[PDB]
Amino acid sequence: GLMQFTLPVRLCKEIELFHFDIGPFENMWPGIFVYMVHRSCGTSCFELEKLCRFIMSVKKNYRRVPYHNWKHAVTVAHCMYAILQNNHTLFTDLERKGLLIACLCHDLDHRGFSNSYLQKFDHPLAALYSTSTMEQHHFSQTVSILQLEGHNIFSTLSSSEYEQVLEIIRKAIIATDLALYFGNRKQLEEMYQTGSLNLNNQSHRDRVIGLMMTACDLCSVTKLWPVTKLTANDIYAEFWAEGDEMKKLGIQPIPMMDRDKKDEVPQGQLGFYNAVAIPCYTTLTQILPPTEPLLKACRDNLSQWEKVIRGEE
Ligand SMILES: Cn1ncc(C(=O)NCc2ccccn2)c1C(=O)Nc1ccn2cc(-c3ccccc3)nc2n1
Numbered sequence: 001g002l003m004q005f006t007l008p009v010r011l012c013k014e015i016e017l018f019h020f021d022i023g024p025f026e027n028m029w030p031g032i033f034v035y036m037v038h039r040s041c042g043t044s045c046f047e048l049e050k051l052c053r054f055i056m057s058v059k060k061n062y063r064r065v066p067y068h069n070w071k072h073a074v075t076v077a078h079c080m081y082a083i084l085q086n087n088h089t090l091f092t093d094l095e096r097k098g099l100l101i102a103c104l105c106h107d108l109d110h111r112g113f114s115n116s117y118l119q120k121f122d123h124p125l126a127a128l129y130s131t132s133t134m135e136q137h138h139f140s141q142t143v144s145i146l147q148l149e150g151h152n153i154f155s156t157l158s159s160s161e162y163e164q165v166l167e168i169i170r171k172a173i174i175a176t177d178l179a180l181y182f183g184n185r186k187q188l189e190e191m192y193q194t195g196s197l198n199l200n201n202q203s204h205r206d207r208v209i210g211l212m213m214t215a216c217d218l219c220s221v222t223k224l225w226p227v228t229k230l231t232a233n234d235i236y237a238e239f240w241a242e243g244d245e246m247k248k249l250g251i252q253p254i255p256m257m258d259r260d261k262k263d264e265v266p267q268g269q270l271g272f273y274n275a276v277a278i279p280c281y282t283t284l285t286q287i288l289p290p291t292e293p294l295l296k297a298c299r300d301n302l303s304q305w306e307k308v309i310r311g312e313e
Pocket residue numbers: 178218220221228229230231232233235255256257261262263264265266267268269271272
């Protein structure tokens with residue numbers, strides 16, 4: 001009840017900033033996550049015995065892949081923490097509870113391969129889930145862990161508040177399927193410009209929460225340049241491995257995943273910042289003004305990639 005988590009002074013201050021890096025000490029990430037839940041929700045939102053046991057079960061069910069790992073899980077939840085703390089009054093008690101958990105669980109049991117590779121492989125999960133394959137799997141694993149004896153962190157909610165929170169978490173996690181982001185932001189784009197955006201419309205919140213989820217999930221591009229630069233190795237190690245596997249099936253992968261075309265990475269990063277990241281954080285800044293630092297940090301990094309191309313690094 002009266003047992004706060006407290007971080008050292010530098011973390012205490014820096015964690016409140018969008019660009020905060022959780023650091024290389026694995027053992028502090030669970031305490032960082034609890035620290036965030038407590039400030040974002042209350043010391044009452046979850047029984048600490050159960051929360052702690054849910055966190056360690058989620059950790060166990062992430063794999064040791066270069067990028068889609070436990071570190072990513074907590075990185076994505078912190079960005080969401082930054083968005084919720086900078087938009088105090090816009091979100092319900094339920095939404096603050098459900099979205100930090102959604103972020104922590106959003107890539108549960110990822111294998112470091114795209115939906116596409118599952119499909120070209122004919123992986124069972126592709127038969128069981130035709131679209132958003134890994135994302136439906138990740139929601140399924142979240143529910144599995146919630147149902148372990150001692151792991152139901154929501155058990156204190158009324159029957160309908162529990163259905164409302166599982167429904168938020170499900171939509172939240174499906175939304176991290178980037179194939180659904182493009183149409184989600186086009187609609188949010190039109191809805192904000194024509195002036196029909198209405199946050200009391202549940203189908204409109206859904207869309208907004210979906211874009212928040214895309215923004216947290218991509219937040220590697222919103223760090224200080226050295227974090228972004230070294231992180232990018234990790235995502236390319238999954239991409240190239242998938243390219244290797246595509247080649248093993250007898251399929252030339254897309255260049256993104258062809259390790260023979262490492263050279264064209266800075267150009268490929270440019271396309272991505274322009275086609276995905278900038279549009280994402282632009283539309284997010286328009287709908288939620290206090291998220292502006294993510295857009296600015298993203299633009300700084302776009303600019304840092306242009307510098308790489310020009311030979312200046
Ligand atoms: C999905 N998803 N999720 C996150 C990211 C990402 O790259 N995020 C950026 C970050 C992630 C982790 C750490 C640092 N920076 C992406 C993505 O599709 N990126 C991309 C997108 C398109 N491409 C094209 C190439 C390319 C590379 C070499 C030669 C030719 C082309 N390269 C591409 N890369």
